Design a protein around this ligand. Structure first.
Ligand SMILES: CCCCCCCCCCCCCCCCCC(=O)OC[C@H](COP(=O)([O-])OCC(O)COP(=O)([O-])OC[C@@H](COC(=O)CCCCCCCCCCCCCCCCC)OC(=O)CCCCCCCCCCCCCCCCC)OC(=O)CCCCCCCCCCCCCCCCC
Ligand SMILES: CCCCCCCCCCCCCCCCCC(=O)OC[C@H](COP(=O)(O)OCCN)OC(=O)CCCCCCCCCCCCCCCCC
Ligand SMILES: CCCCCCCCCCCCCCCCCC(=O)OC[C@H](COP(=O)(O)OCCN)OC(=O)CCCCCCCCCCCCCCCCC
Lengths: 117, 86, 80, 183, 340, 59, 452, 158, 59, 60, 110, 70
């Protein structure tokens, strides 16, 4: 809904970040992709220390110091963001097969129940 | 398409035979980017609505940044702003 | 009170553009005949108003008074 | 047919007459004074060809910004000019430029359509002779639009717009980090 | 063919006679604002001073050995031709329904107001004086920096319009008195409008004797009246341009003229009257605007170039980019977009 | 625009008869010009058989 | 996820105290983690190398282009580590140069291509003169700018003629048009020669080389490698002209002779600049092919790792010279590094194996770059171009071995008393060890790209 | 130079049409809509299905769809002659701002639905339609000085 | 990226030729393709007009 | 005089909007744009569909 | 013809007219008596002027047809303005002149 | 026309320039007559020498006098 009969094609999995529109498709959609996740939702948490692992990467930036001072917050943000994309890279698929395929168990039922759109 | 090829070729061999004044060379290289659009626009007019003219508005918007980087790099053809030199 | 002298140049600067607007209105009703003026409805009056010129002047409501379809216009122009 | 209003299209003679000035000027900046005359002749060409919109775009953004910037530079740090096209500086000019003009005329001939001969080289020069195009009438054009369709295509091809956002980003960050010289 | 050339002569004599008496008008209103009286002596009443001054200052004509005459004999004619006069090609609401202009309005005015700037720059290029051309580059730099935030705001007010021909803004604005009542950034347009046509409280490159006893070049003679007339004519054009879009033409008494012309005339007696009151509306919206120019001439002093570029590239422009982060946003929120 | 689209068949048919009547009459004129020597006036240039419009006419 | 990184760290360089040696550690680790958690697209990459298209104009070829951007990320991580551990505020435009290069390795259609080659070229024009307190860089940047402008309008004129003959733009719409109107062929070779500005094909030859010697060494590593792989990776991704139809073969003949006839050079930068030119000329020979990309995809990495390696080795060799050149450029003469084997000869061993790389002795690189190149040539039948490639390899090997023979003669007076300078040593050791142990896993890649 | 070509002939294989008249048919635009709509739909459908094959719906639909419009304008020239006439007379002024004559609209529409019993079905269910009595809008400027007495008398007599 | 063209009418009857894989029949699209080309440049149109004006020249 | 300092954000936004406020009140508009653009999907509560059209070619 | 072409043709001749009035009757008799420096803010202002013009040239077709791109052209141009406004937040941090000579350090004695 | 506008250029050296700027004062206004002086010797008509005139000034004064229209 929400727009005209115009279409927005995007089958996006790359290094230029995109998302999805309201709806008209058969591929992965916008709001359903953040849901239908798994216990890999801490994969974004695994990167949340990894860019915060730059302190472990500090092998003597200056002479004889450690613990880079509080811009790690910034790094923490990037430590979120890339991992968020990595969670958003967990498009298992939208109703294809021959994969892990919990979508036919946790999203086939939603397309069954929502029988008015 | 005589109208665009002729201005393109004259800008080009003006950029060749330019044994005076670095900036005349620089603006001949600029006028190449409007010798090409007189080709592109009349090909789009002879064809249709917006197919090549989208590339035309692209090359205008980018020719701006061309001249911008060319000036802001020509400023550094020397020392910077001004000092003793030779 | 108000400046009786200073609003006299504003009075003539008012009156000049006033007469300048009135003259445009008069010269366009005399140009078009006793009607208002059309704006650019682009690509569309060149269907519509050109068709009116192919039939008549001004406007008319009838069935059809054409002859050889009132001489159907076809535009031609040189190659670029 | 209003005799001059048919050869008002052939303004290319003023284009080549301005461009023959553009490489042989006296001062270094009377040339770029003539460059805006070249651009406004290009605008006259585009208004005549059926697109006055891009004429007014060129007047707004070329001689509004970039030619203004050429004049802006050429005030300060003015380069040492060789004086004019002297005969000693017109040395080795004709001996390659004549052949180059011929070869580039053959390149304009190589822009022709499909003939694997030199017949296409003569065909484009006679392209106006056998032909004058025939316009048509309005079959179902609902809404009026000239550059609106350009933005419609800029919505369909949105990604190049979001990337030339990055090229304008570069156009502003570069001149900061090449001339400001932070302390 | 004869009607349109007498049309164009009426409109040219209106604008020329207008900008002639405008300088006497502003000097009078400065004078009453400066608690004195203006030109009160010239000839027959005291409305005539500039009309004698034009004939006066023709008959001077010097030239300078530091400069080619070929540029300065034409560059004040350049801004006289293009900046002053053919900005009126758009017929900036030639105040009736009709104009002397076909269509595609606002960006033509943009292009010609853009075209005036190197008319100023090449003017200041002259005479090869190492203290002069830096002042020229100063003038032109602040001039383009406020051109940009004329441009980037009257392209965002037409986001309530979306139609680029001249009239459609004006027929759009009669419902709301759209111009200032929905948005007061008119005032920053106004404070932009003193800069891009510098008749300003800024006076910035008019460092009249701070340089070697001359400010611009002192190209006196016919180039002086050219520069003088073109500056004042750029003022009334950009003031009309304010009264064109972001201040309104077509005052609401013509909207109420449905309750007046239907009580006055029977049926279309040569359209005799409505163009006149419409012109009256646009004229009183225009001269009341430039009365504030003549205020701000004599209210606040010059404005200090470094702070002027501070005033462009630091404050007004980010407020501006916020303001068209919301005017696409708010109409999208509240109901919807405009058609064309 | 809805108003305009209710006019859109009508006006186009107004042209369509014309672009029948202008087209074949031009072809008949060229039948007069090209008679004598046998020639493919009576032949589509487009190799698909479907009706096209004449263009690029010399005046 | 590069655009998010750019817009993040342009805000991060804003409101920074001009320390500006930490932000590159953040960019290095960010690109490292992005590669480490974005390699998971390789499973969804290829069943039969199924392409995936963004909006009709951008292409994602999951075997080829998904390896090319991984190489871009890899060499960027190496460059970013090289600036860590003399700098100005510049990694924003390093990353946007990367963005442009990755767009041209993903560009299906010419509008995206032209935008991105020009974005890329603007990045090169800027990076050439960030070190603005030079007289070398000031001249080199303007020269690079003017000729990039010429070659830019050559690009755009080629594609404008392409639009003039066909109202489409995409090479997807070329679709084996076998009537092959001759101007389509001439347009396409014009577009080829236009994109081939960066390789400096022997009529376009000399101008790059003075630019390479007039940049600092921390820069000429970066722009002897980025567009070298970028424009050619575009040029092999779409095979423009199946063969040359003798136009391009003449260009590479006069290149691979007439740039290896540039033998006698005393300046280091000129020397390995010609090296990186001629080894780029190599991979132009399989631009002359069709349906062949494995040799190209393997030769990029199994060249560029070693190109990066030899630049990193002569970076490490500044410490041992007992003379330096200008503030921006340390080591420009070959004869500066004479007795290096009497210094830390393990790096002499690394320099040895990475120059024996470039000559192509078998068990590390050359029997896997040049072997794939030669099988791709002789698959087609270009019999003459094989033997001229062999002559090019021998004469290239001569000035290659010039470096090792000046590297290990005898030192005048230097052995040992020092402090250390390390923790980037694992980078050079990683490149050298991956150079001389690829013969182990030279068959796993042969299966993996057979399945992609 | 947009020179005009004005050739003349007449082609045999069909009965000739009857053309239509000026821009005042914009007033009659909805009036041909609901009556001649299936004719319109079949015409444009037959045109679109014959992919490129135009000039073959002329004898069937190019005649038929014009016959319907000629019939409608003859009915409206007998039914509500001056009610049509003052309405387009309004509507040729005011740039064809079709908002600008929305009071003589109601007169003409009441006359049509009285005698020729048609409507104006603008398709779309969400808002209100043709009776708005604007109340936040752009009604008119010159309110049709020969026609305000007409709708006033229609409020008076009817 | 193809706006409402004056030559769009020959995409479909070229693309429906390449709907099936007869671009590997390699000739089934050539009438369609060169009709697309004559929509692009009007070449044989123009030669036809040059022929008829040459016949005009000899009267 | 004191500039803004980040580490107390409720304090920072105060001693931003009080000492260098002229970018604060810009970016308040810059956050009033898109955040309010996301608080509309309940606030329209299905208010209206525009329903415009080019030519409606119908079906069989 | 006949509409405004008369204006843009009449006006240059009027300019030459009021010029060429007093070139003849003004008295001339011309008797007698009738490198450089810099700053970054005198140059970078006009250099950075140009991209912020032609992004308005980018924005101008979008604001021409704001309709026909509903709910989606808004999103794209919001992303465009985000990518541009971060360039603005880059350039706010630096562009100003610096007064070179104003010192204040405390004074010490032995 | 020459008698009406009549603007000078200030040369204005001493106390007599204080009375000159008293003519620009509102009591005995210049602009009730037309006297609107520019600070530029080419745009001028008459050259009011006010104040005393030093030996040091006089070449500057004659040089101002020469760059002044006829
Ligand atoms: C509304 C409530 C929001 C709640 C969200 C809840 C969700 C929880 C998520 C948790 C993650 C938190 C995210 C917050 C990030 C804020 C960044 C920050 O504050 O860092 C401070 C920090 C300030 O530097 P500092 O040295 O620590 O402070 C020194 C001084 O004290 C001086 O310091 P300063 O205060 O003067 O700093 C200046 C700052 C003003 O300070 C602020 O932070 C005020 C901003 C308030 C929040 C508004 C931005 C958040 C809105 C979403 C992101 C929009 C961008 O101005 C800006 O940086 C503007 C940022 C860009 C806005 C345009 O900035 C950095 O150093 C770099 C960090 C930037 C990383 C963020 C990158 C993400 C941007 C996403 C863009 C998406 C683009 C999509 C394009 C798609 C193309 C296809
Ligand atoms: C919220 C709901 C609505 C949403 C839509 C919002 C639309 C609102 C309308 C636009 C908002 C108006 C914004 C006005 C911008 C002016 C900002 C400004 O001038 O900043 C002052 C600044 C001071 O300089 P600085 O020292 O650098 O400041 C730092 C001090 N620590 O800069 C300066 O140096 C001051 C220089 C100003 C020069 C002005 C000269 C006189 C102008 C007065 C004439 C105008 C009056 C006529 C029009 C009024 C009509 C009523
Ligand atoms: C969108 C475009 C509109 C504005 C963007 C333009 C730039 C603003 C960013 C900025 O200016 O930050 C810099 C400024 C401090 O920079 P400064 O120290 O002065 O650097 C000069 C050193 N020579 O930092 C500042 O103090 C100015 C920025 C202050 C704005 C902070 C955010 C205000 C937004 C309010 C929403 C906050 C979200 C949380 C709300 C709580 C929940 C309700």
């Amino acid at each position: 809904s929400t727009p005209l009969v115009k279409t927005s094609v995007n089958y996006s999995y790359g290094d230029y970040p995109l998302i999805d529109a309201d709806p008209h498709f058969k591929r992965v959609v916008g709001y359903m992709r953040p849901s239908d996740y798994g216990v890999i939702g801490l994969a974004t948490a695994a990167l949340p220390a990894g860019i915060c692992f730059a302190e472990w990467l500090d092998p003597v930036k200056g002479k004889f110091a450690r613990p880079s001072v509080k811009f790690l917050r910034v790094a923490t943000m990037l430590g979120f963001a890339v991992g968020f994309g990595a969670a958003y890279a967990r498009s298992s698929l939208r109703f294809f097969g021959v994969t892990e395929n919990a979508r036919e168990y946790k999203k086939d039922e939603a397309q069954m129940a929502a029988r008015k759109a | 398409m005589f109208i665009g090829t002729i201005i393109l070729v004259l800008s080009f061999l003006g950029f060749v035979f330019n044994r005076r004044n670095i900036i005349l060379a620089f603006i001949c290289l600029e006028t190449m980017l409007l010798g090409i659009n007189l080709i592109l626009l009349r090909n789009s007019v002879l064809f249709d609505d917006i197919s090549g003219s989208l590339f035309a508005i692209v090359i205008i918007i980018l020719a701006g940044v061309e001249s911008a980087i060319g000036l802001s790099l020509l400023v550094s053809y020397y020392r910077l702003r001004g000092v003793i030199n030779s | 009170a108000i400046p009786f002298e200073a609003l006299l140049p504003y009075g003539i600067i008012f009156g000049l553009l006033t007469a300048g607007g009135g003259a445009m209105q008069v010269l366009h009703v005399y140009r078009n005949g006793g009607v208002r003026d059309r704006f650019a409805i682009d690509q569309w009056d060149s269907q519509m108003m050109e068709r009116d010129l192919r039939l008549n002047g001004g406007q008319g409501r009838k069935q059809v008074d054409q002859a050889t379809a009132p001489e159907a216009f076809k535009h031609n122009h040189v190659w670029k | 047919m209003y005799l001059t209003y048919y050869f008002i299209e052939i303004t290319i003679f003023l284009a080549i007459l301005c461009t023959i000035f553009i490489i042989s000027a006296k001062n270094p900046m009377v040339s770029i004074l003539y460059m805006i005359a070249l651009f406004v002749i290009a605008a006259m060409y585009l208004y005549l060809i059926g697109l006055g919109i891009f004429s007014l775009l060129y007047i707004m953004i070329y001689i509004g910004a970039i030619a203004v910037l050429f004049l802006f530079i050429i005030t300060l740090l003015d380069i040492n000019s060789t004086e004019l096209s002297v005969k000693s500086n017109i040395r080795d000019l004709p001996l390659v430029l004549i052949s180059l003009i011929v070869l580039t005329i053959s390149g304009l001939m190589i822009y022709s359509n499909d003939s694997i001969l030199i017949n296409k080289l003569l065909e484009a020069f006679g392209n106006d002779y056998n032909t004058i195009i025939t316009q048509d009438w309005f079959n179902i054009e609902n809404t009026t639009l000239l550059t609106t369709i350009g933005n419609v295509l800029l919505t369909n091809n949105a990604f190049i717009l979001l990337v030339l956002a990055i090229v304008l980003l570069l156009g502003i960050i570069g001149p900061i980090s090449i001339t400001m010289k932070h302390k | 063919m004869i009607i349109n050339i007498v049309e164009i002569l009426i409109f040219l004599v209106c604008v020329l006679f207008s900008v002639a008496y405008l300088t006497v008008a502003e000097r009078k209103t400065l004078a009453y604002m400066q608690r004195r009286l203006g030109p009160n002596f010239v000839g027959y009443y005291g409305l005539l001073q500039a009309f004698a001054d034009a004939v006066k200052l023709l008959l001077k004509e010097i030239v300078l050995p530091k400069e080619s005459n070929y540029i300065i004999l034409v560059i004040s004619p350049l801004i006289t031709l293009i900046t002053a006069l053919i900005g009126w090609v758009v017929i900036p609401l030639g105040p009736g329904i009709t104009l002397g202009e076909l269509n595609l309005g606002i960006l033509f005015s943009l292009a010609i107001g853009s075209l005036g700037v190197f008319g100023s720059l090449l003017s200041g290029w002259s005479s090869n004086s190492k203290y002069s051309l830096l002042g020229s580059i100063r003038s032109t730099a602040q001039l383009i920096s406020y051109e940009l935030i004329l441009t980037s705001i009257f392209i965002i007010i037409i986001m309530f319009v979306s139609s680029l021909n001249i009239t459609t803004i004006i027929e759009t604005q009669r419902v709301v008195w759209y111009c200032i009542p929905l948005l007061p950034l008119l005032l920053i347009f106004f404070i932009a409008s003193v800069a891009e046509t510098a008749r300003p409280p800024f006076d910035l490159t008019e460092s009249e004797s701070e340089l070697v006893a001359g400010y611009f070049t002192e190209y006196s003679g016919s180039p002086f009246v050219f520069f003088f007339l073109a500056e004042y004519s750029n003022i009334i054009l950009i003031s009309a341009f304010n009264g064109y879009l972001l201040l309104g033409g077509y005052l609401s008494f013509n909207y109420s003229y449905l309750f007046n012309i239907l009580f006055n005339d029977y049926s279309y007696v040569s359209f005799l009257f409505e163009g006149l009151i419409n012109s009256s509306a646009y004229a009183i919206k225009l001269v009341f605007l430039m009365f504030s120019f003549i205020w701000v001439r004599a209210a606040f002093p010059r404005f200090t170039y470094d702070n002027l570029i501070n005033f462009c590239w630091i404050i007004l422009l980010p407020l501006l980019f916020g303001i068209f982060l919301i005017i696409p946003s708010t109409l999208y929120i509240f109901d919807s977009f405009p058609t064309l | 625009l809805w108003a305009r689209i209710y006019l859109m068949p009508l006006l186009q048919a107004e042209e369509d008869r014309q672009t029948v009547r202008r087209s074949i009459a031009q072809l008949e004129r060229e039948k007069e010009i090209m008679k004598g020597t046998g020639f493919d006036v009576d032949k589509s240039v487009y190799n698909d058989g479907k009706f096209h419009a004449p263009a690029l006419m010399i005046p | 996820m590069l655009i998010l990184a750019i817009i993040s760290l342009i805000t991060f360089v804003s409101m920074s105290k001009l320390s500006d040696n930490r932000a590159i550690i953040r960019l290095i680790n960010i690109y490292l983690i992005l590669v480490l958690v974005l390699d998971s697209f390789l499973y969804l990459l290829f069943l039969n190398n199924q392409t995936y298209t963004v909006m009709g104009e951008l292409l994602i070829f999951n075997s080829f282009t998904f390896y090319i951007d991984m190489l871009i990320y890899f060499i960027m991580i190496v460059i970013s580590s090289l600036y860590g551990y003399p700098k100005k505020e510049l990694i924003i435009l390093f990353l946007i140069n990367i963005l442009g290069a990755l767009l041209i390795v993903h560009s299906n259609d010419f509008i995206t291509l032209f935008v991105a080659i020009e974005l890329q070229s603007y990045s090169i024009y800027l990076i050439t003169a960030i070190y603005n307190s030079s007289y070398k860089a000031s001249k080199a940047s303007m020269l690079y700018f003017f000729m990039g402008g010429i070659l830019s309008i050559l690009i755009a004129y080629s594609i404008n003629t392409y639009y003039s003959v066909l109202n489409s733009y995409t090479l997807h719409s070329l679709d084996s048009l076998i009537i092959n109107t001759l101007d389509l062929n001439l347009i396409l070779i014009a577009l080829s020669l236009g994109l081939l500005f960066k390789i400096g094909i022997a009529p376009l030859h000399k101008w790059l080389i003075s630019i390479y010697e007039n940049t600092p060494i921390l820069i000429t590593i970066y722009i002897s490698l980025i567009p070298k792989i970028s424009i050619l990776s575009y040029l092999v991704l779409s095979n423009i002209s199946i063969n040359s139809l003798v136009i391009s073969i003449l260009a590479i003949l006069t290149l691979l002779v007439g740039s290896v006839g540039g033998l006698l050079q005393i300046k280091i930068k000129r020397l390995l600049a010609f090296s990186g030119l001629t080894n780029a000329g190599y991979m132009m020979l399989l631009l002359l092919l069709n349906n062949n990309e494995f040799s190209y995809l393997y030769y990029i990495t199994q060249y560029s790792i070693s190109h990066l390696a030899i630049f990193m080795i002569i970076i490490f060799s500044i410490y041992y010279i007992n003379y330096i050149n200008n503030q921006y450029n340390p080591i420009i003469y070959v004869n500066q590094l004479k007795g290096l084997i009497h210094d830390n000869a393990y790096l002499v061993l690394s320099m040895a194996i990475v120059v024996f790389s470039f000559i192509g002795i078998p068990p590390l690189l050359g029997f896997f770059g040049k072997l794939n190149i030669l099988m791709s040539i002789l698959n087609n039948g270009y019999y003459f171009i094989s033997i001229v490639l062999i002559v090019a390899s021998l004469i290239s090997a001569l000035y290659y071995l010039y470096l090792l023979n000046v590297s290990i003669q005898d030192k005048n007076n230097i052995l040992i008393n020092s402090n250390e300078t390390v923790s980037s040593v694992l980078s050079y050791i990683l490149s050298s060890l991956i150079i001389l142990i690829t013969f182990g896993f030279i068959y796993n890649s042969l299966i993996i790209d057979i399945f992609n | 130079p947009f020179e005009d070509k004005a050739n003349m002939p007449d082609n045999v294989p069909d009965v000739v049409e009857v053309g239509a008249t000026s821009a005042p048919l914009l007033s009659a635009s909805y009036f041909i809509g609901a009556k001649c709509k299936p004719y319109n739909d079949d015409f444009m459908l037959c045109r679109e299905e014959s992919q490129g094959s135009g000039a073959i719906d002329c004898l069937k639909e190019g005649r038929r769809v014009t016959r319907c419009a000629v019939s409608v304008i003859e009915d409206i020239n007998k039914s509500c002659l001056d009610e049509f006439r003052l309405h387009w007379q309004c509507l040729e002024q005011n740039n064809h701002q079709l908002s600008g004559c929305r009071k003589a609209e109601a007169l003409l529409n009441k006359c049509v639905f009285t005698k020729l019993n048609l409507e104006k079905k603008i398709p779309g269910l969400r808002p209100d339609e043709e009776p708005v009595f604007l109340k936040k809008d752009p009604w008119i400027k010159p309110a049709v000085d020969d026609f305000k007495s007409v709708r006033a008398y229609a409020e008076a007599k009817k | 990226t193809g706006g409402r063209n004056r030559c769009f009418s020959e995409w479909q009857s070229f693309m429906h030729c390449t709907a099936k894989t007869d671009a590997k029949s390699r000739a089934q699209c050539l009438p369609n393709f060169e009709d697309y080309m004559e929509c692009l440049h009007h070449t044989k149109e123009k030669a036809r007009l040059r022929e008829i004006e040459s016949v005009l020249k000899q009267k | 005089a004191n500039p803004g300092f980040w580490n107390g954000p409720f304090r920072y936004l105060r001693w931003s909007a009080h000492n260098r406020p002229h970018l604060f009140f810009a970016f308040a508009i810059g956050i009033a744009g898109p955040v309010a653009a996301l608080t509309l999907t309940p606030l329209r509560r299905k208010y209206l569909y525009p329903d415009h059209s080019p030519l409606p070619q119908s079906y069989p | 013809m006949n509409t405004f072409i008369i204006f843009i043709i009449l006006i240059p001749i009027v300019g030459f007219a009021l010029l060429a009035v007093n070139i003849l009757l003004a008295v001339y008799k011309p008797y007698n008596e009738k490198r450089l420096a810099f700053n970054a803010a005198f140059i970078l202002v006009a250099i950075l002027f140009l991209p912020f013009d032609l992004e308005i040239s980018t924005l101008l077709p979008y604001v021409m047809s704001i309709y026909l791109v509903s709910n989606y052209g808004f999103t794209i141009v919001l992303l465009f303005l985000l990518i541009l406004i971060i360039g603005f937040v880059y350039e706010i941090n630096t562009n100003a002149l610096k007064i070179n000579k104003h010192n204040k350090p405390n004074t010490d004695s032995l | 026309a020459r008698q009406g506008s009549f603007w000078p250029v200030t040369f204005g050296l001493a106390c007599c320039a204080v009375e000159m700027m008293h003519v620009s004062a509102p009591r005995y206004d210049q602009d009730r007559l037309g006297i609107i002086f520019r600070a530029s010797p080419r745009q001028s008509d008459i050259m009011i020498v006010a104040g005393t005139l030093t030996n040091k000034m006089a070449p500057v004064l004659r040089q101002v006098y020469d760059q002044m229209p006829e």
